Amino acid sequence: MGKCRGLRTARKLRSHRRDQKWHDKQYKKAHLGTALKANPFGGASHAKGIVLEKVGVEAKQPNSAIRKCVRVQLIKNGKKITAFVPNDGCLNFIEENDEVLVAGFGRKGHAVGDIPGVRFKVVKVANVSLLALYKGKKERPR
Amino acid sequence: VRMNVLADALKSINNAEKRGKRQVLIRPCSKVIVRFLTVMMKHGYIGEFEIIDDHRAGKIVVNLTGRLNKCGVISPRFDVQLKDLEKWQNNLLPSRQFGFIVLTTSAGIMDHEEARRKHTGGKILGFFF
Amino acid sequence: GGKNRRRGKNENESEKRELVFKEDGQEYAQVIKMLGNGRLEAMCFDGVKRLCHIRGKLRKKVWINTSDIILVGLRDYQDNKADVILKYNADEARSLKAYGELPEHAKI
Amino acid sequence: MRAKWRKKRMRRLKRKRRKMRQRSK
Amino acid sequence: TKKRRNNGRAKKGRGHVQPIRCTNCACCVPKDKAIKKFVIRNIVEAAAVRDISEVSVFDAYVLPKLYVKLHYCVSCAIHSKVVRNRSREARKDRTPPPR
Amino acid sequence: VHGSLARVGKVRGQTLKVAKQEKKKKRTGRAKRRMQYNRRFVNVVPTFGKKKGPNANS
């Protein structure tokens, strides 16, 4: 309903755009610093940790299954996260007190699918990938 | 208030063309309005025009053909320097075969096609097509 | 309880019933008390209470009220959790009591 | 009206918590 | 959404109008929102006029009227069937119903 | 259901094994592209109305 068009208003336009960028969600999330602090990864793509004990997250109402997550503690921070072990019978490959490398789930901050409270997945069990053990291309070292 | 006289002269010409009127009256008159109308008439978008002279700024009566499609103003008079001109006439104009951009250069009020022919930039006023 | 619900599989009741016993990693239990969200508190007929979850197959098709005999399948990794697999009626509960299946601490 | 009653209950809780925090401090 | 151009009230170029009490409800309704009705009825009756025009000790006695100005709730007037609903296109007819 | 219905690897642990029946070596590089060109631009038998998806089992 009105914006200054005049020839010496570069300061007003620039300052208003700079002031209003702070209402864009992703801009503020990326430039504030609270998300980089609250992120259980230190702003990294992957992270190694130790398995505390396996758990049985039950899926949300329109589906029914028991999703079989694990509870990991991260090396560099000491934070406790919950990670997902995706495949048919891949929870047998993960004992307790063995270090696993986990990665993100694919939405950059959010729960994917019917699983509540889970945001990461497990990609390596002990220096060997969960996709070589799932096809028999490798095996656990003991 | 009437900050800009040319803006409302051109908007009152353009509001009447959409309506089929044979004539308009526009007021106040100004030096830049008469030059812009002469440029718009040399090409054939409007007919003759008459200046009514009170002892004040005056009024103009324009004979409208049916050829004018749109005329308008660029609100701050930006500086245009013979290299911005192509990027200007790719936003304002509807094609490359017709329609003119009007700018004031140190050699008078003219169109872009004459500005490049005389190697001069200046300030943009408006356009008509 | 009566309703306009003539729709749905109409009538799943009969005077005949056949027993089902325990298996590998599968125990009996007694409902201790009712919770929300379809959950439940139970008590395995020997040890732990082992809070249970009513599985997707039983939801609103076979109801479970407090203080009844049930057959639950234990989880290997977790211990305190289990899933309600089957319900035992009064006659079948007493039958199990006769066959000596359940340690006779809970009665019908 | 859940809106103004929500408002009043939140105002009450906030008054209580502020008065407690000030008293014990 | 916006059901009436005039918001269901006669106010234009004013901030405030004085409230008034709904005549059976005792409600509190703005003077130019309330539903008004001016009744002018015979004091005696329409049927029992003969029993009185005959007993009167005056030969030509005209019976007085009884003027009352009634103000109504919106709900209270809808409930006594002083007004009713109308079609979306018929709500725009503002003429008094034919006698 | 028989015992710990929430067991892991249940369905993959009771699937009948089938050996792969494979033999013939598949062509590679330019030779595959040459075959795919033939199989749809010059090896053709046309009809109106009908549907002809390359894997149609119907």
Next chain:
RNA sequence: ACACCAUGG
């Protein structure tokens, strides 16, 4: 010139 009228595998 207006008694009561809650809930839903």
Next chain:
RNA sequence: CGGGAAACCAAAGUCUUUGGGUUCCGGGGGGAGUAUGGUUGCAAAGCUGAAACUUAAAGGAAUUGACGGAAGGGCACCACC
């Protein structure tokens, strides 16, 4: 006239044929006008004002049904009198 998702609007029009001047202000739904710091007030409270976390929709206008302890006109001893 023209505009708009439409309800509607001579302005909510002169807008992809986009530029008359200028102030305020919004950026999916919640957490929340909350916590915290500042300021004002005798008090109640006003002004300024986040985040972690959570979620696939919340919402607007209009259409066709069904329902109404809504109104009008009719009807049936599987309704009443």
Next chain:
RNA sequence: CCUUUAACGAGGAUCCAUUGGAGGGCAAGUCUGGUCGCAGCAGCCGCGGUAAUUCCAGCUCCAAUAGCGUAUAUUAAAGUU
């Protein structure tokens, strides 16, 4: 190392091409066995409760190809700054 060169060095069964997928978005099967709201899949909508086009496999087919998939930062899409 390349380049130049001798002498050996191919019948396709090995001198054996992979990585992802086949409901939609989005190129490609309502083919056959197994499981039966479980195991699992699924970026999103959604698949599985005894006749599964989506799970586990076999066969067939689609895409790019000595490369292809995944997690994260960022740009265009965003006229959602």
